[PDB]
């Protein structure tokens, strides 16, 4: 009769019958691989109802493959693997470095599917690129807690008596074809105390324009006056603010 019966049973595949058990000549039925199975490229996945109520031949076309290789932050799959989904046991793919990573020549950039149905153990074939030497800050310091490779952070500080002007930290980020420091080296500026106080019936010996950390100002009473107090005071510096060690002396008469 001009009709075929059920189509052939294909291992690990299920045919789409669409709610019927009888099919007319020239009917084309397509099979879909079952869960945990992927179709083999370059193979037939359907049958056809020919004359004599006979279905065309079909061979197993499903496997049995790894999952798509897991996403790496250091390397991307090369072509043509990057567009593939069929990875039977034994399949080996190749990677290439992303930015800002570079090859580690001693290590292979290739992975394999386990019977296991699992990709081989991952190694660091693509390593983090390094940022330039951070250099130095005059009168300050650079804190490098964890190297200077891509993704690293460094902080800046100014020695006692200096104030920091600029950025307080920098990060090694990817910059086009390489990796560079997010922010330039800041500046450590000398902190000045307020102008020293004058005193009644006394003077400051050779008063300077600016007074920095620990610098001192010496006092002297005018003729006929007695000094009561510290002969000199010095510049103290805390929390980036200058402040004199204490009050200036007094010149009492007479």
């Amino acid at each position: 009769m001009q009709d075929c019966g059920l189509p052939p049973d294909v291992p690990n595949a299920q045919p789409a019958l669409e709610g019927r058990t009888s099919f007319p000549e020239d009917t084309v039925i397509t099979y879909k691989c079952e869960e945990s199975f992927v179709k083999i490229p370059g193979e037939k996945d359907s049958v056809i109802c020919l004359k004599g109520s006979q279905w065309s031949d079909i061979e197993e076309f499903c496997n049995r493959s790894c999952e798509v290789p897991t996403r790496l932050n250091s390397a991307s799959l090369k072509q043509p693997y990057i567009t593939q989904n069929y990875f039977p046991v034994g399949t080996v793919v190749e990677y290439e470095c992303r930015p800002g990573y570079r090859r580690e020549p001693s290590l292979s950039p290739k992975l394999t599917c386990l019977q296991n149905l699992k990709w081989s153990t991952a190694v660091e074939f693509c390593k983090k690129k390094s940022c330039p030497n951070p250099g130095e800050i005059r009168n300050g310091q650079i804190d490098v807690p964890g190297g200077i490779l891509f993704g690293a952070t460094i902080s800046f500080s100014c020695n006692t008596g200096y104030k920091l002007f600029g950025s307080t930290s920098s990060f090694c980020l990817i910059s086009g074809s390489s990796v560079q420091w997010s922010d330039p080296l800041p500046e450590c500026r000398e902190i000045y105390c307020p102008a020293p106080p004058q005193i009644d019936n006394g003077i400051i010996q050779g008063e300077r324009d600016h007074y920095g950390y620990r610098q001192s100002v010496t006092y002297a009473c005018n003729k006929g006056f007695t000094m009561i107090g510290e002969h000199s005071i010095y510049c103290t510096v805390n929390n980036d603010e200058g402040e004199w060690s204490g009050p200036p002396p007094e010149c009492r008469g007479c």
Copy 2:
């Protein structure tokens, strides 16, 4: 042949020894009464002569000031320093003691007043001053009460420095002048012990010396995690250098 009572001399009293009759050749001496002093080169005694007659005697006492009161700034000059006769109008001169100096604008002279009193005293001899104390590098000098003869000054070293030498000085008289009893002390920077090294970590740009408030920053080697404070600083536990706390630790992952 015995004389009777000796002559009455104004402002003087004779020493009679309770006697009312005196034999020939008896010599009686008079003592000036309160406030009076005998006049140098004058007779103060009489002698009983023949004819029961006393020898003549004239007033020999002049009202006089007392020996000038002692001053600590100056001393009487010669010859006043050895004198006791100071009638009204007498002026004496002083000279400075040590360690005092002359106040050029003033007179170093005193006059006995009509009321038998020395004129008002002024500061003609003033205390000398020791030289300017100077400066102590990284330290301070406290002058609580001037730098004249007898004054005291103290020394101190700023935070982070230790005082080596004298802690005070006193303006003493030294021969022909006044000088400070002690020389300036030195204020020397205190250093903390060398900062400790840590397993599997380093000191970022270590220095050969670390003073007060100076810090040392640590960093762990690739593959280790730091546990504790990243940097420590040099404190001063008087008068010693000491690190703020323990260095961090690097734990292997």
